[PDB]
Amino acid sequence: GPPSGKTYMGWWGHMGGPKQKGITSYAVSPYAQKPLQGIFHNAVFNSFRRFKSQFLYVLIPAGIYWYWWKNGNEYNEFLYSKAGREELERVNV
Amino acid sequence: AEVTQLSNGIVVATEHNPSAHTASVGVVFGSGAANENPYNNGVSNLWKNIFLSKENSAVAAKEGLALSSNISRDFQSYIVSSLPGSTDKSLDFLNQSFIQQKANLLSSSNFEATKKSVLKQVQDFEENDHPNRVLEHLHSTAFQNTPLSLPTRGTLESLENLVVADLESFANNHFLNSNAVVVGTGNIKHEDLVNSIESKNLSLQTGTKPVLKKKAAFLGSEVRLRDDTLPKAWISLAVEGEPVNSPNYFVAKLAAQIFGSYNAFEPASRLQGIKLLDNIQEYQLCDNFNHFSLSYKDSGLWGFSTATRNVTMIDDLIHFTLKQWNRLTISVTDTEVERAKSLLKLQLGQLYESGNPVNDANLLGAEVLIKGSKLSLGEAFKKIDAITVKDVKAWAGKRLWDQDIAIAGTGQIEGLLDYMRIRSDMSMMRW
Secondary structure (H helix, E strand, C coil), X not given: CCCXXXXXXXXXXXXXXXXXXXXXXXXXXXXXXXXXXXXXXXXXXXXXXXXXXXXXXXXXXXXXXXXXXXXXXXXHHHHCCXXXXXXXXXXXX | CCCEEEECCCEEXXXXXXXXXXXXXXXXXXXXXXXXXXXXXXXXXXXXXXXXXXHHHHHHHCCCCEEEEEECCCCEEEEEEECCCCHHHHHHHHHHHHHCCCCCCCCHHHHHHHHHHHHHHHHHHHHHCHHHHHHHHHHHHHXXXXXXXXXXXXXXXXXXXXXXXXXXXXXXXXXXXXXEXXXXXXXXXXXXXXXXHHHCCCCCCCCCCCCCCCCCCCCCEEEEEECCCCCCEEEEEEEECCCCCCCCHHHHHHHHHHHCEEECCCCCXXXXXXXXXXXXXXXXXXXXXXXXXEECCCCEEEEEEEEECCCCCHXXXXXXXXXXXXXXXXXXXXXXXXXXXXHHHHHHHHHHCCCCHHHHHHHHHHHHHHCCCCCCHHHHHHHHHCCCHHHHHHHHHHHCCCCCCEEEEEECCCCCCCHHHHHHCCCCCCC
16 A cells, blocks of 8 residues: 555554653553442532533623523514504614 | 471471482571561562672682572572582571571671662662563552562662661561471481481571461552653563462463463474464564463462564454463363473473472472472372363363453553453453
8 A cells, every 4th residue: 555644643552642751550440440439429529610610601601692682582572562663663764 | 209397396398319419408488578568678688688798698608608599479588508518517607697696797888788789789670671570560560559569679769768677677577487497408318407407406586477467369450661762562461360279270370381482583482382373473463472370379370471572563462362361261172281281291390300409499498388398299290180171161261261450561562452452352252
């Protein structure tokens, strides 16, 4: 097969990261490891941490656009009622 | 040949070889590297090297006595070799070296020079001897938080904290009467050694060594010492083996012998009768490997260590090796068992009946410390002849088929995959 260009991911053995030295791993078999030991206290406190650091960036745009949609929908159902029909007459023309 | 044994609190066990030209006489203690907490670690190495110190070796060499020592997981030894006419001189020297005094060996200058030398040797071992430090990390992660995990060599961070008080505390707690066996191998008679010990006094201590609460327990884990600036990729991999005094001792060793050892550069090593070689020689997956069946007092290890330069095909090496390991449970043939019988008779008779008396002294001391008497080689050959294929299949189903493994590696081990594919390759899914 032909050669190809320089990529930024190699394969197992020549992956292409920087050379690393003196960094040791430690892992235990999952047969001697108890899974889901960290669901209780975890799904409460870590989930509250993940919500607290991260909710306000979602809650302010939702608040802005929901308030703007609600004000627009309220103004719609105002001016297509009997009370605002002359205003509908002057803004539709 | 014959091995005799007698007792007075000390244990005197010999092997009168009248054909040999030397005679080794020494004491083999029953403490080892597995009897240290992780803060005084390496104190046995430091006793080895103050016994082999320059002043002590000079005083030994004045009479024509060569010293020798050994630090294992289970047993220490302190062996003095001489001509067969100087067994009294060797006993009196060993008496003067350990029993009669220790303060002249433990002077300030001798201790500081020896601590400097062992710190140099441990650093040189740590950064230059790669397959042995892989095997030491394999022990350190197979048996972790448990006293069989401690290396015999000691660690740099602990060994620079030892002072003379720890040496004396270990000596008072482990160099004892019941803990020791005095061994004479080579060209000495048993009656001469017993009459010469009773001619002196040679009483080491009162005895009754620490119990050591934790019992060794295997723990499947891994450790990865990845160093990209090394030319090879050294990797050991083992399961929980058989300890000594087990009925599956020779079966575990014969299972190690089935897949043998290999060196890719030797021509007669590439032609062995192993079915792993047909898979391993095609794309040159490794440079060497050896299958080991290590047996300790509490537990053991069974696995293989290897080294390779083909760092992109390490997973294929592990894959074909472990599929060959899975062949033991299902379909190991009769001819492989007969071949492993013949080769294990060969290497076992080379090990126990080599010409060197100090190795005989180490082996006899370890065996009569653990199991009270030495099993002679003829009964060992009968026990090897009693093994059938069904025994190997039952042992492999007990110990190999879908059991946890322990992995240690250093060098360019990025090609080595995760723990889970290596663990899941222990069972074939096709059986």
